Structure formats: structure tokens, C-alpha cells
Motif scaffolding. Structure first.
Motif, PDB file in Angstrom:
ATOM      1  N   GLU A 131       0.794  -1.102   0.081  1.00  0.00           N
ATOM      2  CA  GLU A 131       0.227   0.070   0.095  1.00  0.00           C
ATOM      3  C   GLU A 131       0.851   1.191   0.040  1.00  0.00           C
ATOM      4  OE1 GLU A 131      -2.770  -2.678  -0.341  1.00  0.00           O
ATOM      5  OE2 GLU A 131      -3.297  -0.654  -0.206  1.00  0.00           O
ATOM      6  N   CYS A 132       0.052   2.331  -0.074  1.00  0.00           N
ATOM      7  CA  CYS A 132       0.900   3.553   0.043  1.00  0.00           C
ATOM      8  C   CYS A 132       1.760   3.927   1.189  1.00  0.00           C
ATOM      9  CB  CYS A 132      -0.024   4.811  -0.182  1.00  0.00           C
ATOM     10  SG  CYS A 132       0.738   6.382  -0.654  1.00  0.00           S
ATOM     11  N   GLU A 133       1.062   3.354   2.463  1.00  0.00           N
ATOM     12  CA  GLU A 133       2.019   3.614   3.818  1.00  0.00           C
ATOM     13  C   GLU A 133       2.845   2.336   3.987  1.00  0.00           C
ATOM     14  OE1 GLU A 133      -0.576   6.735   3.749  1.00  0.00           O
ATOM     15  OE2 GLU A 133       1.281   6.207   4.816  1.00  0.00           O
ATOM     16  N   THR A 178       7.848   3.810   4.259  1.00  0.00           N
ATOM     17  CA  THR A 178       9.002   3.073   4.804  1.00  0.00           C
ATOM     18  C   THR A 178       9.377   1.793   3.622  1.00  0.00           C
ATOM     19  OG1 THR A 178       7.438   1.430   6.048  1.00  0.00           O
ATOM     20  CG2 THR A 178       8.460   3.124   7.160  1.00  0.00           C
ATOM     21  N   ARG A 179      10.505   1.541   3.714  1.00  0.00           N
ATOM     22  CA  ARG A 179      11.169   0.688   2.622  1.00  0.00           C
ATOM     23  C   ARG A 179      11.395   1.749   1.523  1.00  0.00           C
ATOM     24  NH1 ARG A 179       9.178  -0.728  -2.347  1.00  0.00           N
ATOM     25  NH2 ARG A 179      11.084  -1.573  -3.114  1.00  0.00           N
ATOM     26  N   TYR A 180      11.189   3.048   1.841  1.00  0.00           N
ATOM     27  CA  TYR A 180      11.485   4.039   0.831  1.00  0.00           C
ATOM     28  C   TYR A 180      12.323   4.988   1.685  1.00  0.00           C
ATOM     29  CZ  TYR A 180      12.407   7.947  -2.353  1.00  0.00           C
ATOM     30  OH  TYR A 180      13.102   8.773  -2.977  1.00  0.00           O
ATOM     31  N   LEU A 181      11.702   5.427   2.548  1.00  0.00           N
ATOM     32  CA  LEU A 181      12.315   6.392   3.839  1.00  0.00           C
ATOM     33  C   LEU A 181      13.073   5.347   4.595  1.00  0.00           C
ATOM     34  CD1 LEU A 181       8.969   8.277   4.482  1.00  0.00           C
ATOM     35  CD2 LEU A 181      10.805   9.587   4.046  1.00  0.00           C
ATOM     36  N   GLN A 182      14.001   4.487   4.024  1.00  0.00           N
ATOM     37  CA  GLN A 182      14.564   3.815   4.957  1.00  0.00           C
ATOM     38  C   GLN A 182      15.754   3.305   3.973  1.00  0.00           C
ATOM     39  OE1 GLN A 182      14.385   1.295   8.702  1.00  0.00           O
ATOM     40  NE2 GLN A 182      15.827   1.569   7.190  1.00  0.00           N
ATOM     41  N   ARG A 183      15.426   3.262   2.574  1.00  0.00           N
ATOM     42  CA  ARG A 183      16.464   2.836   1.695  1.00  0.00           C
ATOM     43  C   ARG A 183      17.242   3.895   1.581  1.00  0.00           C
ATOM     44  NH1 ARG A 183      20.058   2.813  -0.439  1.00  0.00           N
ATOM     45  NH2 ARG A 183      20.831   1.271  -1.869  1.00  0.00           N
ATOM     46  N   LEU A 184      16.936   5.085   2.206  1.00  0.00           N
ATOM     47  CA  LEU A 184      17.619   6.417   1.806  1.00  0.00           C
ATOM     48  C   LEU A 184      18.439   6.635   3.082  1.00  0.00           C
ATOM     49  CD1 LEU A 184      15.295   9.086   0.291  1.00  0.00           C
ATOM     50  CD2 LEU A 184      16.870   7.332  -0.736  1.00  0.00           C
ATOM     51  N   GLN A 185      18.768   5.690   4.000  1.00  0.00           N
ATOM     52  CA  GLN A 185      19.511   5.810   5.127  1.00  0.00           C
ATOM     53  C   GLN A 185      20.320   4.836   5.184  1.00  0.00           C
ATOM     54  OE1 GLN A 185      15.772   7.458   8.069  1.00  0.00           O
ATOM     55  NE2 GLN A 185      17.046   5.777   8.645  1.00  0.00           N
ATOM     56  N   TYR A 186      20.575   3.738   4.173  1.00  0.00           N
ATOM     57  CA  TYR A 186      21.376   2.664   4.365  1.00  0.00           C
ATOM     58  C   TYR A 186      21.988   2.432   2.930  1.00  0.00           C
ATOM     59  CZ  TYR A 186      21.055  -1.981   2.169  1.00  0.00           C
ATOM     60  OH  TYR A 186      20.793  -3.100   1.347  1.00  0.00           O
ATOM     61  N   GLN A 187      23.261   2.272   3.192  1.00  0.00           N
ATOM     62  CA  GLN A 187      24.081   1.886   2.063  1.00  0.00           C
ATOM     63  C   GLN A 187      24.710   0.555   1.986  1.00  0.00           C
ATOM     64  OE1 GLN A 187      26.545   5.757   0.045  1.00  0.00           O
ATOM     65  NE2 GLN A 187      26.574   5.537   2.364  1.00  0.00           N
TER      66      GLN A 187
END
Lengths: 49, 77, 28
Positions: A31-33, A37-46
């Protein structure tokens, strides 16, 4: 555990068995929610190997 | 006889076991092999190599087949 | 079937297989 062969093939038994009646790996969509997360978190981990 | 719980379809020998009945053959004892039985259930065809019953026949036959061991042979002396 | 070797002591008779010290060539 025990399933059938839908298309009868010559020289092949029509009774197949699953190995452990284990079919693992099914799931549903996102869903959109669940996607924030899984977006706003794949932006914090490399990734690292 | 269907070997497994099989779905509808054409006849395939890979799914059905054929039911035989029985079998009787003729056997005659040979010069070196003795035959016994007729092949029926409880009376199976069996064979055993027959040896010379000559008293000095060192060859013998245990429960595992022919035997000629070095112990019973009259070695030189 | 018996191996037809020149010095094969195994011989076939009407009664059965026979071997005897007569053929066994002790070195004396």
C-alpha cells in the motif's frame, strides 16, 4: 503433499508428490503507507557486500 | 490394477500394473546341475551343482557355495 | 562350464565334479 498431472503425458505417472508439502514464498502487494517505509529507509542505508 | 490414485485420462502403462498368474516349466537334472521344483508358488525352480560322491572327492559344498580349502588337502609330507 | 586349461584339475563326470590328489603334482 499429493497432486495430479493436469496434462497427461505418455509414459509418465499422473501422480506427483510435493516434497514436504512445502510451498513457501507467497505474499501480497504493498500500500501507499507500507511503501513510505522501505523508501524512507532505503535512503538511510548503503548496501555493503 | 491402478498403481496410484490417478485422474481420468487415456490408458498409460506407466500407471497400471499388469496382473500375471503363474508359471510352470519343465526341468531335467543335468550331468553337473540338479534341478528341483516346477516354478509354482511354494514350489519354486531351484538349482544346485551336484558333485561327485566319490569318497576321495576333496571338493565340498558349504552353505555359501563350493569350497576347497588348503587345510583338508593331503599336502606333501 | 569347466575351463579347459591344460592343468585344470576340475573334471566333469556323469555324477558330478571330482578332484583328487592323483592330479595334484606335489614337488616330491
Amino acid at each position: 503433499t499429493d497432486g495430479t498431472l493436469v496434462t497427461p503425458v505418455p509414459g509418465i505417472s499422473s501422480a506427483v508428490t510435493a516434497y514436504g508439502g512445502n510451498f513457501c514464498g507467497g505474499s501480497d502487494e504493498e500500500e501507499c503507507e507500507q511503501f513510505r517505509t522501505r523508501y524512507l529507509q532505503r535512503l538511510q542505508y548503503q548496501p555493503r557486500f | 490394477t491402478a498403481r496410484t490414485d490417478l485422474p481420468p485420462g487415456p490408458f498409460d502403462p506407466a500407471n497400471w500394473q499388469e496382473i500375471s498368474v503363474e508359471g510352470l516349466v519343465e526341468v531335467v537334472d543335468s550331468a553337473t546341475i540338479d534341478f528341483t521344483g516346477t516354478g509354482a508358488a511354494g514350489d519354486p525352480v531351484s538349482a544346485d551343482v551336484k558333485l561327485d560322491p566319490d569318497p576321495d572327492n576333496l571338493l565340498s559344498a558349504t552353505a555359501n557355495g563350493l569350497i576347497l580349502t588348503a587345510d583338508n588337502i593331503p599336502f606333501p609330507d
